Design a protein around this ligand. Structure first.
Ligand SMILES: C[C@@H]1C[C@@H]([C@H](O)CC2CC(=O)NC(=O)C2)C(=O)[C@@H](C)C1
Ligand SMILES: [Zn+2]
Lengths: 218, 58, 103, 159, 51
RNA sequence: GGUUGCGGCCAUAUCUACCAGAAAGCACCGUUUCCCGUCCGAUCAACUGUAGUUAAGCUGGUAAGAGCCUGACCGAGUAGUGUAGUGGGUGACCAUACGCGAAACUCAGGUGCUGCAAUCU
RNA sequence: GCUCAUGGAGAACAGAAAUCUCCAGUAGAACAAAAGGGUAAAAGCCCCCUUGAUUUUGAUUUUCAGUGUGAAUACAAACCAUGAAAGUGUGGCCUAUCGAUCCUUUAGUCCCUCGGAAUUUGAGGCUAGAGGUGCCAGAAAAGUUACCACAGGGAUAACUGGCUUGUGGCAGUCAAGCGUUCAUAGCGACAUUGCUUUUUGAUUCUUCGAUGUCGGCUCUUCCUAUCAUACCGAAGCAGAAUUCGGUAAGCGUUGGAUUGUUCACCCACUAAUAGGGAACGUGAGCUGGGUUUAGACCGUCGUGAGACAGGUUAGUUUUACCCUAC
RNA sequence: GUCUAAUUAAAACAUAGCAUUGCGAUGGUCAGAAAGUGAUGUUGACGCAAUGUGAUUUCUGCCCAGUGCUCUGAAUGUCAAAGUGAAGAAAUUCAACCAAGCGCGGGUAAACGGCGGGAGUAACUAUGACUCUCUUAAGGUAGCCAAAUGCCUCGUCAUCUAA
RNA sequence: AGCUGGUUCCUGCCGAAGUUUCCCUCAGGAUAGCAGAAGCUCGUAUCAGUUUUAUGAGGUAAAGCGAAUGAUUAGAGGUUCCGGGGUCGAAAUGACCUUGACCUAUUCUCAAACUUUAAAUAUGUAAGAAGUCCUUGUUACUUAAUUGAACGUGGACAUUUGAAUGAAGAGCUUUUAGUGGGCCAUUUUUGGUAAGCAGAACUGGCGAUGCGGGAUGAACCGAACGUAGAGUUAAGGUGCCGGA
RNA sequence: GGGUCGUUAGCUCAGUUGGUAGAGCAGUUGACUUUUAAUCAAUUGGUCGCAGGUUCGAAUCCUGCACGACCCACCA
RNA sequence: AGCGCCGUGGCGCAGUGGAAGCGCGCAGGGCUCAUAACCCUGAUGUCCUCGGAUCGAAACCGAGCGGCGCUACCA
RNA sequence: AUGAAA
């Protein structure tokens, strides 16, 4: 019962976020941003795959939600709920206004039209660009074609020409594979619950040796 | 029946026709707005120097 | 608002020309004399047929008047006016504002 | 309603600075100002007395008058089709000098020095400034400086 | 235009008027004040304030 | 060079944790009759410079220190932007030509200087 | 002279929150308010003294016509306060908090005039303020008209047309699921891309020195997003019956009941009883039910005259002999 | 029976009948520039004047708080001019007094017109005789209806119809 | 009658505005601007819709949020005299387990009314004669002070008298018309689903403007007009209509 | 033809906006009585109309799916 | 669709920044053979939810939820 | 004022 995304697609107008000025919004339907085995670790999922955009547009929580479900459905169906971690990477903070006219025949006598154009909120949306990733996933090469099938379905749900990319990176890091590996057979790394903390060459040697001990025991 | 509320269109053409003449700057400007103490002393000093020059060439 | 009953202020009185003490009092607009030229002209202007002849004012907005004082020098009695802001409540008998007190 | 005040659309303009809030240093006061001095105008929002208008923020003028803690300044202001002379009773916290004028005076006395030396020897000063003239020939060698051939780079995605 | 009906309060007497919705109509500055009660003489209410 | 007083710029000067401190100077410190102020000679006023201590303040050094500052032949001639085009594209947008040109990041360095006067082995 | 918010650690009653004490505390508080700037031996809190919220008039800035009003800025000559003093101080830390003429009135000057000369009341003057115009550069002011009039207006509405197409309608992509089992025979949620202008909005370009304004009747022609009929393909098509889909608009798509009706709903036949366009086709072609003047009735609203896409009833439908088309 | 001649002949007007109101002639209603003027009136309450409603039959409920009309005056309310007093040299000012009217208080609905909401409850459930409460000047009584008054509404049931 | 309509010969020269402020002001006026005419003082400059050098000011783009404020995703590691509790047990600031808080550093995403930073473009000012230096005259101002300030005497400092370029004369006044419904395009941009929509910013145009191309068209591209001739081009094109 | 609201024990009604269905009526039993009635206590009953994500996890989040209850629907 | 009102005990209705009123209903006692009525007594109100300002709110200003009302004309 | 059925 909603208006079309073609009506609310482009960045025709500046960011209208939630604030102390609006104060009153219709909450999203998306609430999840991470799926799969998010508590997996870095060496556990080495491969990282992306879904990006070649447009410059607004994307609704509804499309984000349906696409999330389609990809996660495929993966959790075929390779199980704990063979991957999916992570969305765009949050809808933008808000969409509508000057709600009537849906009758006889509104003429009380419509009043464009006097009072400033519309009330009726949803949210994201704001993406070239290359700003929409989705990312971390898993293994065995799970590769499975996950890119999921991304294919999510493309079919989002508008525009979105692309898939298999990164040169180890998990969700900004690090490439062999550098990660030399570091990790070395000892500059220290795993967190999901992500990892690195060793600086700066600062407190005492804290570094409190941490990262094997690197000192080279 | 609304109307065109405002526009600065064509005003700069109108100005730069015969426009933005710098104000004619002058030697010996106004001593209005100047500290009146200074005005007063300046008066008496000029009286003195006029007298002095006339006495040097009388 | 509140004001005292006496004030040290300049008295341009031709022998003080300086600050003396001045008893303050309010200014009352003063009863209107008949036989003033406006009233005389007005009685003539309204005299007879023709109805009302001068306007008469109803579109009122101000819920306040400017308050105004009289300042009588104790020595010279050279009175003097000076006007203040607009105030809903006004007072000269000043029970001071004691800060260190309860509700 | 439409709001057009003395200190309207001025927020970031009279924002004092970062890590420079509080008081003012003292050269602002120990500086000197005379008739004919050219001066810059930036406003110190920490001094709410003697201020200029935001038009005169970041502007330049000449002195005409001097008082206890303040200075007269003349400015020219476009009003329709003319420049109007406008007189401001400003504070020195908002004033400062024009180093352009200072350097001009230094150039002046140096020009005079050159004229003195050329009165001493008759040696063709050429006082005037001249632009960055186009440059003259030369011979660049190659020893230890052979030309490395370069060429473009292929397209890598870099993700 | 507005028909207005209000009760005069010191009497209990109805007052019906009507006047356009955009013309100005007067309002007083009424305020109520609490007061304590002392020994009542003839009709003058024997009251007091804290001060 | 050190110290004190008055200072300019007001973090290379700050913050944290420790180490040291010849002399002199500051300081800590001792006292309450006197002017003075306090709930209180703690603060402040006054007296001695005696009793004593450099522990603290203060000064400096250390820290793969946090912070700050500078520089980069680091990122990046990227992002953005001015002008031109009967340029491309469905369009969003983009490339090209003449031009200007960031910030973040990455790495390297530095951690108060200095004026007037007086004084100290 | 002090330094706030907050947090931590303590002290009986006393707890999360009562008062006191220590540490950190760049402001995370407070400054009458709206918001924003500004402020840390202060502009904040406390304490002391005061009345510069004073007088004279001018200059300057803002709005700006460089007019006024309002507010503010910096000085001169005075009188003052406060402080040890520098100094600061002409209302509020800055940004808003307000008002001409005529009249009336008050303060000042104790000055001018009252015109044959005087005195005294009274009146009128000059300088400066108030009493107020908020439609805030400032008239003194209730309605209706369907009995209506006029000057004009496409600068401005109601039809049609035009751009747009949210909404209305139509068709696609993808496929979680349904379908006994199986996503796709057939349907296809969540999401998404398009089309059309047959709705309804939005807009106001044309049209107000008039484009005759709903429907029906009549009558032709056109589109197809094909209801039927011709030929075909697919099926969860055994046959019959049915559903989906293609070329296809050649041909046809009713009679009636009620309603002004479009539409809707029923009856019945039917091979089938599909949707729409042509100035929402068509009034010098009809009719005039309806709408849409004037009469009149009811209800509700109104003090009332009078109002009501609220209901009912009654209410003049002009001319072709010209050109074109036929 | 009469009307909108020249777009409306009707449910509209009238009508008889019902009811109300004023008036005893020094008057009621109305007229007129006035006037030794006039119409009703060559008249006299079974009459003149002004209203409403509309044959007959039956019946006309509750509200006088509001607005009007009207009756009190017993009143420190308000209270003009003329008139009185005091002050003043006079202009003049002030005070007192004070007509009607208004105000105050009564009456009046075949005068204008008005005539409510909310909760709970019955041995199936539903419903609510009953009860409670806020409030009004009093809360629509008899009686009548989707009627020319009823949005929703093509109201629900029946009948008339094949529909 | 602030409204409609009409307003009579030729040519030449110049040539607009639909914007500001006030008005019971919104179909109108006053004012300022735009434009004409009369000229006036002087004679190449007290200029410039421009650049450079130097100096300032801005707080928009972009960027950041492991930097402030505000919002936000997920983990891990901890403090429980510490919120909820589940257990061992009598309970114990006793022990254990779990769970929302808070702390720590990490991570993903953002801001027209957030920001350290911070452009491009636009914008102010200076680039000398009314100046620089030296000396000393004035004053009731200022200074402790013949100290300073302001204005000056006298003298010196020229051809490069203080960067570039151009200047078709520079400057100055008076008076007055018409106008005060505006529109289109590029780029920025607010409202709106959107609009040949409404509305602002810069510039250029149409109006008021024809010619050549876009078949066709108010505005686009090219170029702006006395009468003619000769050539060369623009934009656009060269199958035929159509010159190639 | 849409826009909304809701479909909870045999009946009715809260429900909790997420983790547990609670109240009433009814019924069965019990108490009561000489036995009944009413009255008191106790259990009975609950996928809350069909699939989705799923808060670890779901009636209640909300997506659709059959029932109803309202508000709207030429025109001149 | 736009605008306005209101949410207070079990029910109804008052309530005004220093902090909740009344009646009826409820409970207890007494009279009565028992229940009524009656007499003596007491209690009960997250003031629709969230947030804010305030030294402090039912009140005062935003957000939402609900029950209603008013608008809806010229075509 | 009322006082359940046999
Ligand atoms: C309003 C009230 C009166 C008003 C003034 O009399 C109004 C009008 C009088 C008139 O008829 N013509 C005018 O010029 C002004 C005045 O001065 C105010 C302060 C006080
Ligand atoms: Zn005096």
């Amino acid at each position: 019962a909603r208006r079309p995304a073609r009506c609310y697609r482009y960045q025709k107008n500046k960011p209208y976020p939630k604030s102390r000025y609006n104060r009153a919004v219709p909450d999203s339907k998306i609430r999840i941003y991470d799926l799969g085995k998010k508590k997996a670790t870095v060496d556990e999922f080495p491969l990282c795959v992306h879904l990006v955009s070649n447009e410059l547009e607004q994307l609704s929580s509804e499309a984000l939600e349906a696409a999330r479900i389609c990809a996660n459905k495929y993966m959790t169906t075929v390779s199980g709920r704990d063979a991957f971690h999916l992570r969305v990477r765009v949050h809808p903070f933008h808000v969409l206004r509508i000057n709600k006219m009537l849906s009758c025949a006889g509104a003429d006598r009380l419509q009043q039209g464009m006097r009072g154009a400033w519309g009330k909120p009726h949803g949210l949306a994201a704001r993406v660009d070239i290359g700003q990733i929409i989705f990312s996933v971390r898993t293994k090469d065995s799970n590769k074609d499975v996950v890119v099938e999921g991304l294919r379905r999510a493309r079919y749900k989002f508008p525009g020409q979105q692309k898939i990319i298999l990164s040169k990176k180890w998990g969700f890091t900004n690090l490439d594979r062999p550098e990660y590996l030399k570091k990790r057979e070395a000892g500059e790394v220290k795993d967190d619950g999901a992500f990892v903390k690195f060793l600086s060459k700066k600062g407190s040697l005492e804290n570094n040796i409190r941490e990262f001990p094997e690197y000192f025991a080279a | 029946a609304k109307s065109k509320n405002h526009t600065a269109h064509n005003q700069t053409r109108k100005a730069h026709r015969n426009g933005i003449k710098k104000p004619k700057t002058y030697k010996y400007p106004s001593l209005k707005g100047v500290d009146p103490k200074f005005r007063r002393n300046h008066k008496h000093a000029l009286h003195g120097t006029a007298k002095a020059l006339a006495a040097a060439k009388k | 608002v509140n004001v005292p009953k006496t004030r040290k202020t300049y008295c341009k009185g031709k022998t003080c020309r300086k600050h003396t003490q001045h008893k303050v009092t309010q200014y009352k607009a003063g009863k209107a004399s008949l036989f003033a030229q406006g009233k005389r002209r007005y009685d003539r202007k309204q005299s007879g047929f023709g109805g009302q002849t001068k306007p008469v004012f109803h579109k009122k907005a101000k819920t306040t008047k400017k308050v105004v004082l009289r300042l009588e020098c104790v020595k010279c009695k050279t009175r003097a006016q000076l006007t203040l802001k607009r105030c809903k409540h006004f007072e000269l008998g000043g029970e001071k504002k004691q800060k260190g007190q309860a509700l | 309603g439409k709001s057009h005040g003395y200190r309207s659309r001025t927020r970031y303009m009279f924002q004092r600075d970062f890590r420079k809030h509080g008081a003012v240093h003292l050269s602002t006061y120990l500086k000197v100002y005379k008739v004919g001095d050219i001066v810059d105008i930036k406003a110190n929002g920490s001094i709410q007395k003697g201020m200029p208008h935001k038009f005169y923020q970041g502007k330049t003028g000449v002195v005409y008058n001097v008082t206890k803690s303040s200075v007269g300044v003349i400015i020219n202001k476009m009003v329709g089709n003319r420049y109007l002379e406008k007189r401001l009773n400003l504070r020195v916290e908002h004033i400062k000098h024009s180093k352009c004028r200072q350097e001009f005076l230094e150039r002046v006395k140096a020009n005079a020095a050159k004229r003195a030396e050329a009165k001493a020897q008759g040696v063709a000063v050429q006082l005037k400034r001249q632009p960055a003239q186009p440059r003259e020939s030369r011979i660049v060698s190659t020893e230890g400086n052979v030309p490395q051939t370069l060429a473009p780079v292929p397209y890598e995605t870099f993700i | 235009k507005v028909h207005l009906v209000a009760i005069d309060i010191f009497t209990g007497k109805k007052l019906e008027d009507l006047s356009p919705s955009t013309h100005n109509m007067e309002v007083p500055v009424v305020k109520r004040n609490e007061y304590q009660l002392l020994d009542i003489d003839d009709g003058f209410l024997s009251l007091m304030n804290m001060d």
